[PDB]
Design a protein around this ligand. Sequence first.
Ligand SMILES: [Cl-]
Ligand SMILES: [Cl-]
Length: 421
Amino acid sequence: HHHMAYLEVLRYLYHKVKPGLERISMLLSKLGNPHLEYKTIHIGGTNGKGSVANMVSNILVSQGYRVGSYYSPHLSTFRERIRLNEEYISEEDVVKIYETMEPILNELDKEEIFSPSFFEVVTAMAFLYFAEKNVDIAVLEVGLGGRLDATNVVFPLCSTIVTVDRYTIEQIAWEKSGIIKERVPLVTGERKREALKVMEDVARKKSSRMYVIDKDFSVKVKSLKLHENRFDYCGENTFEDLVLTMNGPHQIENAGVALKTLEATGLPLSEKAIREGLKNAKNLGRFEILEKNGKMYILDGAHNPHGAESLVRSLKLYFNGEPLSLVIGILDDKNREDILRKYTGIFERVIVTRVPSPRMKDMNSLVDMAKKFFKNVEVIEDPLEAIESTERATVVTGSLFLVGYVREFLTTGKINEEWKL
Ligand SMILES: [Cl-]
Ligand SMILES: [Cl-]
Protein backbone atom coordinates (compact mmCIF):
# COMPACT_ATOMS: atom_id res chain seq x y z
CA HIS A 1 0.00 0.00 0.00
CA HIS A 2 3.10 2.23 0.53
CA HIS A 3 5.09 0.13 -1.91
CA MET A 4 4.94 2.71 -4.71
CA ALA A 5 5.78 5.45 -2.26
CA TYR A 6 8.74 3.36 -1.12
CA LEU A 7 10.01 2.99 -4.73
CA GLU A 8 9.57 6.77 -5.15
CA VAL A 9 11.67 7.31 -2.02
CA LEU A 10 14.39 5.18 -3.66
CA ARG A 11 14.13 7.22 -6.83
CA TYR A 12 14.76 10.40 -4.74
CA LEU A 13 17.71 8.74 -3.01
CA TYR A 14 19.23 7.36 -6.21
CA HIS A 15 18.87 10.70 -8.07
CA LYS A 16 21.69 11.99 -5.70
CA VAL A 17 30.37 15.24 -3.26
CA LYS A 18 32.84 17.38 -1.21
CA PRO A 19 34.06 15.43 1.77
CA GLY A 20 33.23 16.50 5.35
CA LEU A 21 30.97 15.96 8.38
CA GLU A 22 29.31 19.39 7.93
CA ARG A 23 26.26 18.34 5.91
CA ILE A 24 25.54 15.22 8.02
CA SER A 25 25.96 17.15 11.28
CA MET A 26 23.49 19.80 10.06
CA LEU A 27 20.93 17.25 8.80
CA LEU A 28 21.03 15.41 12.10
CA SER A 29 20.84 18.66 14.07
CA LYS A 30 17.68 19.65 12.23
CA LEU A 31 16.28 16.16 13.04
CA GLY A 32 16.98 16.60 16.78
CA ASN A 33 20.32 14.79 16.87
CA PRO A 34 18.70 11.34 16.88
CA HIS A 35 22.18 9.79 16.81
CA LEU A 36 22.77 10.95 20.41
CA GLU A 37 19.73 9.13 21.69
CA TYR A 38 21.35 5.70 22.29
CA LYS A 39 24.69 3.96 22.82
CA THR A 40 26.63 3.20 19.71
CA ILE A 41 29.32 0.83 18.39
CA HIS A 42 31.32 1.92 15.43
CA ILE A 43 32.95 -0.46 12.95
CA GLY A 44 35.31 0.35 10.10
CA GLY A 45 38.06 -1.30 8.16
CA THR A 46 38.78 -2.23 4.58
CA ASN A 47 37.48 -5.80 4.92
CA GLY A 48 35.39 -7.48 7.57
CA LYS A 49 33.51 -4.45 8.81
CA GLY A 50 30.14 -5.75 7.61
CA SER A 51 30.80 -9.23 9.13
CA VAL A 52 32.10 -7.78 12.40
CA ALA A 53 29.12 -5.40 12.64
CA ASN A 54 26.71 -8.24 11.91
CA MET A 55 28.34 -10.48 14.49
CA VAL A 56 28.24 -7.71 17.08
CA SER A 57 24.56 -6.96 16.36
CA ASN A 58 23.62 -10.58 16.35
CA ILE A 59 25.22 -11.24 19.71
CA LEU A 60 23.55 -8.22 21.33
CA VAL A 61 20.21 -9.11 19.77
CA SER A 62 20.57 -12.62 21.31
CA GLN A 63 21.41 -11.00 24.66
CA GLY A 64 18.07 -9.29 24.38
CA TYR A 65 19.19 -5.73 23.67
CA ARG A 66 17.05 -3.67 21.33
CA VAL A 67 19.58 -3.17 18.55
CA GLY A 68 19.66 -0.90 15.51
CA SER A 69 22.23 -1.92 12.94
CA TYR A 70 23.44 0.06 9.95
CA TYR A 71 25.09 -1.41 6.85
CA SER A 72 26.25 -0.39 3.38
CA PRO A 73 25.93 -1.05 0.64
CA HIS A 74 23.20 -3.64 0.01
CA LEU A 75 23.06 -6.78 -2.04
CA SER A 76 19.39 -7.46 -2.90
CA THR A 77 17.29 -4.83 -1.18
CA PHE A 78 17.95 -1.37 0.10
CA ARG A 79 16.31 -2.44 3.35
CA GLU A 80 19.38 -4.57 4.34
CA ARG A 81 21.01 -1.24 5.25
CA ILE A 82 18.79 -0.54 8.29
CA ARG A 83 17.70 -3.13 10.80
CA LEU A 84 15.94 -3.48 14.11
CA ASN A 85 16.97 -6.59 15.94
CA GLU A 86 18.43 -7.72 12.64
CA GLU A 87 15.14 -7.52 10.78
CA TYR A 88 15.19 -5.23 7.71
CA ILE A 89 13.31 -1.99 7.97
CA SER A 90 9.96 -2.31 6.25
CA GLU A 91 9.10 -0.43 3.09
CA GLU A 92 6.42 1.35 5.16
CA ASP A 93 8.92 2.60 7.72
CA VAL A 94 11.39 3.73 5.11
CA VAL A 95 8.52 5.77 3.66
CA LYS A 96 7.64 7.06 7.17
CA ILE A 97 11.14 8.16 8.07
CA TYR A 98 11.51 9.72 4.66
CA GLU A 99 8.27 11.73 5.10
CA THR A 100 9.55 12.97 8.47
CA MET A 101 12.84 14.18 6.87
CA GLU A 102 11.29 15.45 3.61
CA PRO A 103 10.71 19.11 4.60
CA ILE A 104 14.20 19.23 6.11
CA LEU A 105 15.73 17.69 3.03
CA ASN A 106 13.69 19.98 0.79
CA GLU A 107 15.19 22.93 2.62
CA LEU A 108 18.82 21.67 2.62
CA ASP A 109 18.41 20.56 -1.00
CA LYS A 110 17.96 24.11 -2.15
CA GLU A 111 21.70 24.80 -1.91
CA GLU A 112 24.36 22.52 -3.17
CA ILE A 113 26.71 23.28 -0.23
CA PHE A 114 24.06 22.09 2.26
CA SER A 115 22.49 19.31 0.23
CA PRO A 116 23.17 15.90 1.84
CA SER A 117 24.59 13.07 -0.33
CA PHE A 118 22.88 9.72 -0.79
CA PHE A 119 24.85 8.17 2.03
CA GLU A 120 24.32 11.14 4.28
CA VAL A 121 20.58 10.90 3.82
CA VAL A 122 20.44 7.12 4.34
CA THR A 123 22.64 7.36 7.42
CA ALA A 124 20.45 10.04 8.92
CA MET A 125 17.45 7.88 8.09
CA ALA A 126 18.99 5.03 10.06
CA PHE A 127 19.83 7.31 12.99
CA LEU A 128 16.32 8.71 13.03
CA TYR A 129 14.77 5.26 12.73
CA PHE A 130 16.85 3.96 15.63
CA ALA A 131 15.63 6.92 17.65
CA GLU A 132 11.95 6.48 16.65
CA LYS A 133 12.39 2.80 17.63
CA ASN A 134 13.94 3.55 21.06
CA VAL A 135 16.90 1.22 20.52
CA ASP A 136 19.32 0.50 23.39
CA ILE A 137 22.26 0.40 21.06
CA ALA A 138 23.13 1.02 17.44
CA VAL A 139 25.90 -0.86 15.58
CA LEU A 140 27.23 1.18 12.72
CA GLU A 141 29.23 0.02 9.81
CA VAL A 142 31.39 2.76 8.28
CA GLY A 143 30.36 3.56 4.71
CA LEU A 144 33.85 4.40 3.52
CA GLY A 145 37.10 5.58 5.16
CA GLY A 146 36.04 6.72 8.60
CA ARG A 147 37.33 10.20 9.37
CA LEU A 148 34.64 11.96 7.23
CA ASP A 149 32.17 9.15 6.94
CA ALA A 150 28.59 10.07 7.66
CA THR A 151 28.50 7.57 10.53
CA ASN A 152 31.43 9.30 12.27
CA VAL A 153 29.16 11.78 14.04
CA VAL A 154 28.82 9.22 16.85
CA PHE A 155 30.63 8.84 20.15
CA PRO A 156 30.58 5.06 20.56
CA LEU A 157 31.29 2.61 23.35
CA CYS A 158 34.02 1.18 21.12
CA SER A 159 35.55 1.95 17.72
CA THR A 160 36.74 -0.99 15.66
CA ILE A 161 39.05 -0.94 12.68
CA VAL A 162 38.88 -4.49 11.47
CA THR A 163 41.63 -4.11 8.84
CA VAL A 164 43.56 -1.60 6.82
CA ASP A 165 44.28 -2.96 3.30
CA ARG A 166 45.61 -1.27 0.11
CA TYR A 167 47.06 5.85 -1.31
CA THR A 168 49.74 4.43 0.98
CA ILE A 169 48.72 2.16 3.84
CA GLU A 170 49.62 4.99 6.15
CA GLN A 171 47.15 7.36 4.41
CA ILE A 172 44.38 4.79 4.38
CA ALA A 173 45.20 3.93 8.00
CA TRP A 174 44.90 7.59 8.86
CA GLU A 175 41.47 8.08 7.25
CA LYS A 176 40.26 5.01 9.14
CA SER A 177 41.62 6.11 12.50
CA GLY A 178 39.33 9.21 12.29
CA ILE A 179 36.71 7.01 14.05
CA ILE A 180 38.99 6.83 17.12
CA LYS A 181 37.33 8.97 19.79
CA GLU A 182 38.54 10.44 23.07
CA ARG A 183 38.84 7.80 25.77
CA VAL A 184 36.84 5.39 23.62
CA PRO A 185 38.65 2.11 23.18
CA LEU A 186 39.84 0.92 19.78
CA VAL A 187 39.83 -2.69 18.59
CA THR A 188 41.75 -3.86 15.51
CA GLY A 189 42.30 -7.03 13.49
CA GLU A 190 45.19 -5.33 11.70
CA ARG A 191 48.72 -6.66 11.73
CA LYS A 192 50.63 -4.34 9.30
CA ARG A 193 53.13 -2.32 11.26
CA GLU A 194 52.55 0.80 9.13
CA ALA A 195 48.87 0.69 9.81
CA LEU A 196 49.16 -0.05 13.55
CA LYS A 197 51.71 2.76 14.02
CA VAL A 198 49.11 5.29 12.87
CA MET A 199 46.33 3.84 15.02
CA GLU A 200 48.71 3.66 17.98
CA ASP A 201 49.58 7.31 17.57
CA VAL A 202 45.92 8.38 17.31
CA ALA A 203 44.69 6.22 20.23
CA ARG A 204 47.60 7.26 22.43
CA LYS A 205 46.70 10.89 21.60
CA LYS A 206 42.97 10.27 22.24
CA SER A 207 43.78 8.35 25.47
CA SER A 208 41.98 5.37 23.90
CA ARG A 209 42.82 1.90 25.03
CA MET A 210 43.79 -0.11 21.94
CA TYR A 211 43.39 -3.84 21.47
CA VAL A 212 45.14 -5.62 18.70
CA ILE A 213 44.71 -9.13 17.37
CA ASP A 214 47.42 -11.59 18.56
CA LYS A 215 48.44 -8.94 21.09
CA ASP A 216 45.34 -8.34 23.21
CA PHE A 217 43.26 -11.18 21.87
CA SER A 218 43.45 -14.13 19.56
CA VAL A 219 41.49 -16.97 17.91
CA LYS A 220 42.53 -20.57 17.30
CA VAL A 221 40.84 -22.44 14.47
CA LYS A 222 39.79 -25.85 15.82
CA SER A 223 38.20 -26.92 12.50
CA LEU A 224 36.69 -25.54 9.34
CA LYS A 225 33.62 -27.39 8.17
CA LEU A 226 30.80 -26.00 6.08
CA HIS A 227 28.33 -24.16 8.41
CA GLU A 228 30.16 -25.48 11.45
CA ASN A 229 33.48 -23.68 11.80
CA ARG A 230 34.90 -24.25 15.19
CA PHE A 231 37.38 -22.07 17.13
CA ASP A 232 38.65 -20.95 20.57
CA TYR A 233 38.78 -17.26 21.58
CA CYS A 234 41.17 -15.63 24.13
CA GLY A 235 40.42 -12.07 25.26
CA GLU A 236 39.22 -10.86 28.67
CA ASN A 237 37.16 -14.01 28.43
CA THR A 238 38.12 -17.33 27.00
CA PHE A 239 35.77 -19.53 25.01
CA GLU A 240 36.46 -22.93 23.49
CA ASP A 241 34.76 -24.52 20.45
CA LEU A 242 32.77 -21.53 19.34
CA VAL A 243 30.97 -22.13 16.08
CA LEU A 244 30.52 -19.89 13.09
CA THR A 245 28.02 -20.69 10.47
CA MET A 246 29.74 -18.26 8.11
CA ASN A 247 32.44 -20.02 6.14
CA GLY A 248 35.94 -18.85 5.53
CA PRO A 249 38.88 -18.61 7.99
CA HIS A 250 38.95 -14.75 7.82
CA GLN A 251 35.52 -14.92 9.41
CA ILE A 252 36.96 -16.63 12.46
CA GLU A 253 39.22 -13.63 12.85
CA ASN A 254 36.31 -11.28 12.34
CA ALA A 255 34.60 -13.20 15.15
CA GLY A 256 37.60 -12.55 17.49
CA VAL A 257 37.43 -8.89 16.54
CA ALA A 258 33.67 -8.83 17.27
CA LEU A 259 34.14 -10.44 20.71
CA LYS A 260 36.96 -8.04 21.60
CA THR A 261 34.81 -5.19 20.38
CA LEU A 262 32.12 -6.42 22.77
CA GLU A 263 34.52 -6.98 25.69
CA ALA A 264 36.01 -3.46 25.25
CA THR A 265 32.56 -1.94 25.40
CA GLY A 266 31.80 -3.17 28.96
CA LEU A 267 28.28 -4.33 28.08
CA PRO A 268 26.95 -7.28 29.98
CA LEU A 269 26.84 -10.37 27.75
CA SER A 270 26.15 -14.04 28.25
CA GLU A 271 28.17 -16.77 26.68
CA LYS A 272 24.84 -18.10 25.39
CA ALA A 273 24.28 -14.90 23.39
CA ILE A 274 27.84 -14.91 22.08
CA ARG A 275 27.48 -18.48 20.87
CA GLU A 276 24.04 -17.98 19.39
CA GLY A 277 24.87 -14.60 17.84
CA LEU A 278 27.98 -16.11 16.17
CA LYS A 279 25.93 -19.06 14.93
CA ASN A 280 23.35 -16.54 13.54
CA ALA A 281 25.73 -14.09 11.87
CA LYS A 282 25.52 -13.92 8.10
CA ASN A 283 27.42 -11.81 5.58
CA LEU A 284 25.37 -11.80 2.44
CA GLY A 285 27.09 -12.79 -0.79
CA ARG A 286 30.39 -13.02 0.98
CA PHE A 287 31.34 -16.67 0.45
CA GLU A 288 27.86 -17.49 1.33
CA ILE A 289 26.83 -21.07 0.81
CA LEU A 290 23.11 -21.71 0.50
CA GLU A 291 21.71 -25.23 0.22
CA LYS A 292 18.53 -24.92 -1.79
CA ASN A 293 16.57 -28.01 -2.72
CA GLY A 294 19.58 -30.27 -2.08
CA LYS A 295 21.90 -28.23 -4.29
CA MET A 296 24.68 -26.01 -2.96
CA TYR A 297 25.28 -22.52 -4.17
CA ILE A 298 28.43 -20.58 -3.41
CA LEU A 299 27.32 -16.97 -3.65
CA ASP A 300 30.27 -14.69 -3.80
CA GLY A 301 30.24 -11.19 -5.13
CA ALA A 302 33.97 -11.27 -6.08
CA HIS A 303 34.42 -8.83 -9.00
CA ASN A 304 38.18 -8.10 -8.67
CA PRO A 305 41.04 -10.24 -9.63
CA HIS A 306 41.92 -10.03 -5.92
CA GLY A 307 38.41 -11.03 -4.76
CA ALA A 308 38.27 -13.88 -7.26
CA GLU A 309 41.63 -15.23 -6.06
CA SER A 310 40.22 -15.20 -2.49
CA LEU A 311 37.15 -17.02 -3.65
CA VAL A 312 39.26 -19.78 -5.13
CA ARG A 313 41.27 -20.10 -1.93
CA SER A 314 38.05 -20.45 -0.01
CA LEU A 315 36.77 -23.02 -2.55
CA LYS A 316 39.87 -25.15 -2.09
CA LEU A 317 39.22 -25.37 1.65
CA TYR A 318 35.62 -26.34 1.67
CA PHE A 319 35.13 -28.12 -1.69
CA ASN A 320 38.38 -29.91 -2.23
CA GLY A 321 37.02 -33.22 -3.66
CA GLU A 322 33.93 -31.57 -5.13
CA PRO A 323 32.96 -31.18 -8.78
CA LEU A 324 31.95 -27.59 -9.36
CA SER A 325 30.10 -25.48 -11.87
CA LEU A 326 30.59 -21.73 -12.36
CA VAL A 327 27.95 -19.25 -13.27
CA ILE A 328 29.80 -16.01 -14.07
CA GLY A 329 28.66 -12.53 -15.18
CA ILE A 330 30.99 -9.59 -15.10
CA LEU A 331 30.41 -6.00 -16.13
CA ASP A 332 32.76 -4.49 -18.67
CA ASP A 333 33.94 -1.86 -16.16
CA LYS A 334 35.79 -4.61 -14.37
CA ASN A 335 38.98 -6.49 -15.20
CA ARG A 336 37.17 -9.35 -16.88
CA GLU A 337 40.24 -11.16 -18.11
CA ASP A 338 42.25 -11.00 -14.92
CA ILE A 339 39.12 -12.22 -13.04
CA LEU A 340 38.40 -15.16 -15.40
CA ARG A 341 41.98 -16.30 -15.19
CA LYS A 342 41.66 -16.97 -11.46
CA TYR A 343 39.09 -19.64 -12.22
CA THR A 344 41.05 -21.82 -14.58
CA GLY A 345 41.53 -25.46 -13.58
CA ILE A 346 38.72 -25.49 -10.98
CA PHE A 347 35.36 -25.98 -12.61
CA GLU A 348 33.91 -28.92 -14.35
CA ARG A 349 31.54 -26.58 -16.14
CA VAL A 350 31.53 -22.89 -16.96
CA ILE A 351 28.46 -20.90 -17.80
CA VAL A 352 28.77 -17.22 -18.66
CA THR A 353 25.57 -15.30 -18.04
CA ARG A 354 24.37 -11.70 -18.32
CA VAL A 355 24.54 -9.44 -15.27
CA PRO A 356 20.94 -8.35 -14.68
CA SER A 357 21.44 -4.61 -14.89
CA PRO A 358 21.10 -2.01 -17.61
CA ARG A 359 24.78 -1.40 -16.84
CA MET A 360 25.67 -4.76 -18.48
CA LYS A 361 27.43 -4.25 -21.86
CA ASP A 362 29.66 -6.44 -24.09
CA MET A 363 28.36 -9.86 -23.32
CA ASN A 364 30.02 -10.67 -26.61
CA SER A 365 33.64 -10.03 -25.60
CA LEU A 366 33.04 -11.46 -22.12
CA VAL A 367 32.14 -14.79 -23.66
CA ASP A 368 35.08 -14.62 -26.09
CA MET A 369 37.45 -13.98 -23.22
CA ALA A 370 36.03 -16.89 -21.25
CA LYS A 371 36.56 -19.01 -24.32
CA LYS A 372 40.23 -17.87 -24.25
CA PHE A 373 40.50 -19.73 -20.82
CA PHE A 374 38.17 -22.85 -20.84
CA LYS A 375 37.03 -25.55 -23.33
CA ASN A 376 33.76 -25.67 -21.47
CA VAL A 377 32.11 -22.34 -22.08
CA GLU A 378 28.30 -22.24 -22.27
CA VAL A 379 26.29 -19.09 -22.49
CA ILE A 380 23.06 -19.03 -20.57
CA GLU A 381 22.02 -15.45 -20.66
CA ASP A 382 19.30 -15.52 -18.00
CA PRO A 383 21.23 -16.15 -14.79
CA LEU A 384 18.26 -17.93 -13.16
CA GLU A 385 18.14 -20.37 -16.05
CA ALA A 386 21.89 -20.71 -15.65
CA ILE A 387 21.55 -21.74 -11.99
CA GLU A 388 18.50 -23.86 -12.73
CA SER A 389 20.66 -25.78 -15.22
CA THR A 390 23.34 -27.03 -12.84
CA GLU A 391 23.47 -30.26 -10.86
CA ARG A 392 26.85 -29.63 -9.23
CA ALA A 393 27.64 -27.35 -6.40
CA THR A 394 27.47 -23.98 -8.25
CA VAL A 395 29.59 -20.88 -7.74
CA VAL A 396 27.71 -17.71 -8.70
CA THR A 397 30.13 -14.83 -9.02
CA GLY A 398 31.55 -11.96 -11.13
CA SER A 399 29.22 -9.20 -10.02
CA LEU A 400 27.43 -8.09 -6.83
CA PHE A 401 24.35 -7.25 -8.95
CA LEU A 402 24.43 -10.81 -10.25
CA VAL A 403 24.87 -12.33 -6.80
CA GLY A 404 22.19 -10.20 -5.12
CA TYR A 405 19.76 -10.99 -7.91
CA VAL A 406 20.26 -14.73 -7.79
CA ARG A 407 20.28 -14.79 -4.00
CA GLU A 408 17.02 -13.01 -3.99
CA PHE A 409 15.43 -15.52 -6.27
CA LEU A 410 16.87 -18.47 -4.48
CA THR A 411 15.70 -17.25 -1.10
CA THR A 412 12.40 -15.68 -2.14
CA GLY A 413 11.36 -17.20 -5.43
CA LYS A 414 10.91 -13.69 -6.75
CA ILE A 415 12.68 -10.53 -7.78
CA ASN A 416 11.68 -7.34 -6.09
CA GLU A 417 10.89 -4.21 -8.10
CA GLU A 418 14.02 -2.39 -6.82
CA TRP A 419 15.79 -4.31 -9.57
CA LYS A 420 13.65 -2.33 -12.07
CA LEU A 421 14.68 1.09 -10.52
CL1 LIG B 1 26.30 -28.81 -13.45
CL1 LIG C 1 19.11 -3.68 -6.05
